[PDB]
Design a protein around this nucleic acid. Structure first.
Ligand SMILES: CCCCCC(=O)CC(=O)N[C@H]1CCOC1=O
Ligand SMILES: CCCCCC(=O)CC(=O)N[C@H]1CCOC1=O
Lengths: 230, 230
DNA sequence: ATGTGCAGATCTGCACAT
DNA sequence: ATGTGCAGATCTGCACAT
């Protein structure tokens, strides 16, 4: 199946609200075996966040303003280039409340990850993090820094529009699957790209189809497009 | 006291009206001294543009089908990293009607330029480009990508309408059958209602499909409805 | 420019166990 | 509440005329 960056690009083009968006993010993050994702939009110290990370970990992350201690975030600030962190392989270098920070984090599968920092509007920033419960991250091929930037930029933008610009939003799968159908792919081809069972694609769409009571994909497509659903 | 990518990053957040956006786009090109800016979203054979470029260049570029000629577009297709194009320095190298192209383009201040290509949803792409009248011109590719991703999101997601696009059409017959198709009718059903031979509907639509080069009614209707051909 | 004719490919519609 | 199987229903892709 296509890489998570591509899945993220594909996602950043669907409607509509934060709930949907969050759902799809989680789905992608799971798919590639990640404890969760974490999108942070930070302006000085105020901090907007869309994340998967355990509700507990978030509570304490903010309650203790870990945003200042977090080495990942610190690094995200000093450079807008994709990077990977481990906490373990990093433990030897400086760390004391840091060393302890990672530990508390570990209790929630957040041991290592990939973080893509973006220079956002008005001099601010955004960073997207795919978090792994493994000690470190070894990749067969390094992820393209330029590609990462381009997709996170699209996600950042997409997320911001939630709070800037029917409400029967199709759920992320119906949406992502339907958008392929709209570009010609056949279900089995969709399944091949998404890394899911043909029956998955098969079911998701017939259900959407039933919802609207239409007898053909073309109809679902026409219908979905006309109602600004995809 | 800024670079244009910076201003473009900001512009990406702007609200909200279509015109408001396009103006913002032009204002940034002007502020920096650019004959213009150009945003292209290459889908299939289908192209959509949002430009500052001269009203004439626009109209001709598509009529003359320079999509397939422009050495800048071609390069962007096989490259998704920021790059500059001279037009003068490029004359030595290959150039059949290419040499003609750059000259004719020079008739509108488009001599050199900076183009940034990005990968968008469903494996398509978009590219952003700033045109200068200078013979040639003299940036962080990662930063460049991060920005354009935001602009693409902002242009793309809010359904802004193009300032131009490769022309394509549907004739009355096609448009009538496709409109039924877009309502879940089967081809046999269509033939019965419009009172014609199954094979007429078949061949007609079949023909349109070949013209746009798509493998499925859905794709065809998805396309038609999106390029307002119906 | 328009059809005919067919042979896979691919959906769709149903029934049923997971 | 989903995932499986299936077969009749449609469509898509050539080949060969009109
Ligand atoms: C409340 C959501 C937490 C945001 C944290 C984040 O941005 C992602 C990140 O790299 N931080 C990781 C580093 C170790 O544990 C974390 O939390
Ligand atoms: C409809 C207007 C077409 C815009 C396409 C574009 O991207 C332009 C561009 O960068 N290339 C330049 C190179 C020489 O003249 C151009 O068009």
């Amino acid at each position: 199946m296509q890489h998570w960056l591509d899945k993220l690009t594909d996602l950043a083009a669907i409607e509509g609200d934060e709930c949907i968006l969050k759902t799809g993010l989680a789905d992608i993050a799971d798919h590639f075996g990640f404890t969760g994702y974490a999108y942070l939009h930070i302006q000085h110290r105020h901090i907007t966040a869309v994340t998967n990370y355990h509700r507990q970990w978030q509570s304490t992350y903010f309650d203790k303003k870990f945003e200042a201690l977090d080495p990942v975030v610190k690094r995200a600030r000093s450079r807008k280039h994709i990077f990977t962190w481990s906490g373990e392989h990093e433990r030897p270098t400086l760390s004391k409340d840091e060393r302890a920070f990672y530990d508390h984090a570990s209790d929630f599968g957040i041991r290592s990850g990939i973080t893509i920092p973006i220079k956002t509007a008005n001099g601010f920033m955004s960073m997207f993090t795919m978090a792994s419960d493994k000690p470190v991250i070894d990749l067969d091929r390094e992820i393209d820094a330029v590609a990462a930037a381009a997709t996170i930029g699209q996600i950042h933008a997409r997320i911001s529009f939630l709070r800037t610009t029917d409400a029967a939003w199709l759920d992320p799968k119906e949406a992502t699957y339907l958008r392929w159908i709209a570009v010609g792919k056949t279900m089995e081809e969709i399944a091949d790209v998404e890394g899911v069972k043909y029956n998955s694609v098969r079911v998701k769409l017939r259900e959407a189809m039933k919802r609207f009571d239409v007898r053909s994909k073309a109809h679902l497509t026409a219908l979905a497009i006309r109602r600004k659903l995809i």
